[PDB]
Amino acid sequence: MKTRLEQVLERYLNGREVAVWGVPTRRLLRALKPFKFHTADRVDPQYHYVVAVTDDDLTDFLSDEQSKSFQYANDYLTFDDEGGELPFERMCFNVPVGRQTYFGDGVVGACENGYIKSIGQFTSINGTAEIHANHQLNMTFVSDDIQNFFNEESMAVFQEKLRKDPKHPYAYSKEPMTIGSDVYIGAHAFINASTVTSIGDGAIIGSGAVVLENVPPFAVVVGVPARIKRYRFSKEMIETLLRVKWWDWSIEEINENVDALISPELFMKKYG
Amino acid sequence: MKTRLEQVLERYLNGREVAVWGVPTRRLLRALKPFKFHTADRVDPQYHYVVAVTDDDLTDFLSDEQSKSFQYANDYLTFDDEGGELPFERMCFNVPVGRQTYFGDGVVGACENGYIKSIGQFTSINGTAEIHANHQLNMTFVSDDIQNFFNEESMAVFQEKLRKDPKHPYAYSKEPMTIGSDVYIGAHAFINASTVTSIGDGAIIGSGAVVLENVPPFAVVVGVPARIKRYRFSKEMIETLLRVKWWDWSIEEINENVDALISPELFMKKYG
Amino acid sequence: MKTRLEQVLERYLNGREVAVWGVPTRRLLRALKPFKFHTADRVDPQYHYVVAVTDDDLTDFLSDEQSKSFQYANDYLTFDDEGGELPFERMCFNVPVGRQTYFGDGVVGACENGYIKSIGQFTSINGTAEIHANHQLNMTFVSDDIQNFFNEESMAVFQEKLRKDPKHPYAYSKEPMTIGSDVYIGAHAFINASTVTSIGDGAIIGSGAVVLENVPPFAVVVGVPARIKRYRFSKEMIETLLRVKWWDWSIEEINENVDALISPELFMKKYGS
Ligand SMILES: CN[C@@H]1[C@@H](O[C@H]2O[C@H](CO)[C@@H](N)[C@H](O)[C@H]2O)O[C@H]2C[C@@H](N)[C@@H](O[C@H]3[C@H](O)[C@@H](O)[C@H](N)C[C@@H]3N)O[C@@H]2[C@@H]1O
Ligand SMILES: CN[C@@H]1[C@@H](O[C@H]2O[C@H](CO)[C@@H](N)[C@H](O)[C@H]2O)O[C@H]2C[C@@H](N)[C@@H](O[C@H]3[C@H](O)[C@@H](O)[C@H](N)C[C@@H]3N)O[C@@H]2[C@@H]1O
Ligand SMILES: CN[C@@H]1[C@@H](O[C@H]2O[C@H](CO)[C@@H](N)[C@H](O)[C@H]2O)O[C@H]2C[C@@H](N)[C@@H](O[C@H]3[C@H](O)[C@@H](O)[C@H](N)C[C@@H]3N)O[C@@H]2[C@@H]1O
């Protein structure tokens, strides 16, 4: 598919040459082949778009006096940062991701696995959070890679049972999960992709939480298994929030309405 | 002793040359010295065995149309994948590992530490699972690296007390862990190498579980600390399973009795 | 700002050349600018100090027969190991770290974020442990990166409310946390940098524990969220330990009192007063 980098370069490269900051990998070279590129030496934002290969390389680049006139995404990006936030809506494999939303390699993998339908705007997911499905639980075995030994006939009856399974092994037979906007997920959290179809808008998933069922909008869930500890707002305000959907506002609307975003009391007065 | 790649090349290289896909590392070049190798350009499975250096390199390889004649393990492997599954029983730091069994870097480390006696067949361990022992808890200090300041005399006094400690700090004076066959371990799980000697065949360890005691065969454990939630099968069927040991079956046997593998009621009718 | 490597070379390089064991990186070559360095081939501790670039590189070096003449820290180090243990007290992003103390990249990042005041001596932190703060919980939004869209007037109003927030979003307006000496933190543990200011001396944080408030000295905490399960020692010996502070002892004193360190009963007979 189109990587994050490719989506950014299609939007912001603007005919410049890519200055690679770090050791180029084969995956990077494949992504840059539609573009002119070279190993960064002296860089000028009028002439160059800087791609740091790793986050390590970005730290070095941003520590260098040459980076001062380079703006995030517009002039530079990290290649190995497929979950990194962007100022525009993007695709992660074939999952739409909203603005200013970030996540780590586990969620990137879940996006590739087809476990995720969409990730909302202004959503914050700690890099250590994980999303995996259940194996089959209604067979004699729980192994998945046993199937590498299955011939065509055995694999057919095995696959056929996997669909009829109402418990959705490997996320079969279910809708991929929606992760809403203005969502927060802390370190080492886990969401089960066989048994969860929605993390509601505004949900907060605490560190260490193991989420086995849907999280309602603006619920705060903690623990193993994860349980609703409280809601962020009253029922009336949650009702208003889901109607107004400030997370779809334009940048101008976000700034014009900043007092209502900073103050829930002013939000309710204006919209509720 | 031998890395995973070396065990695979010993079995499958078949007089071909190794085509390296990705930037090589010091440890890869050490593993490749007995074999002729070169940087991959054009590759053909009749002539070449493709070694992807990193998991990212493999992703790039399998996206290239040159790869679709290449079979997993038989014609290509990832070097940085010591926990990766294989169609034959292998060694991981002198720990026997069964067919189609995979685990991540934490479990690889525990094998190197001598914490694990063996890992069974068709066993599936999430890459973020961890296995560590306890430090000593019957001394004034809990630190391990204070011993870096111990002269000869102090080290001898410290080691003699560790060796008679019935709680097996650093897994001293206990049997290394057996992990059974048809076992599942989910994300962020932990197993204490000081207090656990067996994960029974068929055991399922839920994501986030913190396992401090042996897990009986076919038990499902969850939580912090881990406690049994349920058993996969009746006591009679568990007895039957531990007798038949389908996980030692030939590939022919697996396909012939695939009906019994997918239907536990057929399994008990045929073998119970 | 000085890397761990530079701090070690400043003390131990002793006029030698750095032999780089592994593929060098941008960050390594910048840290090696003040030094003589070359790609390692044949290495001799008389002439060379070996820097493994990655931990995997270090595994390869230590499997090589040339490495048996090299002592840890004195003659070799890993570049990608900013939280690695050392025989001297060091800085990690302006955070003092005691001797023989180790931690992983999660704690290193917490150091860089300003969340940690100091980390004590002989403290063992699993590499998978994580320390981060809460976002603001008193606004309409919980996102942080929404602020990339704030103009200067919006950002000012946002930052003003964060600074007056008594629950310390992003660790605002609180003391960075102290992590004591002789501390142990297990795999996948988490400490909340918004609501924790002290992990007491001698505390044990079990694997998977989610620590949301201060851990008293020598308490053992487990669970999500973490709860005190037991103390390592009696009240009297905890008082004695906090006074003797053997973790500040010199190498000479540590070996002279090895018996008191190994047997708590002997520790109290000598120090319990
Ligand atoms: C550079 N500082 C940032 C900090 O900013 C906060 O403290 C700053 C200094 O006091 C303030 N100037 C700022 O207003 C305030 O918001 O907010 C945290 C929030 C946390 N979820 C995470 O998200 C990042 C992810 O970790 C990362 O992976 C992703 N790429 C980007 C995310 N923002 O890391 C950032 C980062 O540590
Ligand atoms: C590539 N797809 C796989 C999926 O297969 C399932 O969904 C497919 C598409 O719907 C089906 N065709 C297939 O029959 C079914 O089993 O099962 C999961 C099971 C999970 N424990 C893990 O194990 C992998 C580890 O994560 C990895 O590290 C290790 N190398 C190999 C393991 N299989 O990742 C795989 C992987 O996401
Ligand atoms: C190389 N072996 C070491 C082992 O030594 C123990 O078993 C040995 C016998 O097999 C004994 N000779 C030794 O006396 C005893 O203490 O103690 C553990 C303690 C654990 N917190 C971790 O800490 C390490 C961190 O994982 C690492 O990241 C950090 N750099 C250094 C830490 N010690 O990994 C080490 C490592 O596995």
Automatic annotation (TrEMBL), chains A, B:
> What are the binding positions for CoA 3 in this chain?
K167, Y184, A187, S207, K229, R230
Q: Which residues bind CoA 2?
A: N134
One Gene Ontology molecular-function label: metal ion binding
* Residues that, per the record, bind CoA 1: N126, N134, Y184, I185, A187, S207, K229, R230
Q: Which InterPro entries match?
A: Trans_hexapeptide_repeat (IPR050179), Trimer_LpxA-like_sf (IPR011004)
Gene3D superfamilies from the UniProt entry: Hexapeptide repeat proteins
Keyword check for Transmembrane helix, yes or no.
no
Q: Which UniProt keywords apply?
A: Metal-binding, Plasmid, Transferase
Sequence positions that bind acetyl-CoA: N126, N134, Y184, A187, S207, K229, R230
Domain of life of the organism encoding this protein = Bacteria
Q: Which residues bind Mg(2+)?
A: E252
Do you know which NCBIfam families this protein is assigned to? amicyc_ac_ApmA (NF000084)
Recorded protein name is Aminocyclitol acetyltransferase ApmA
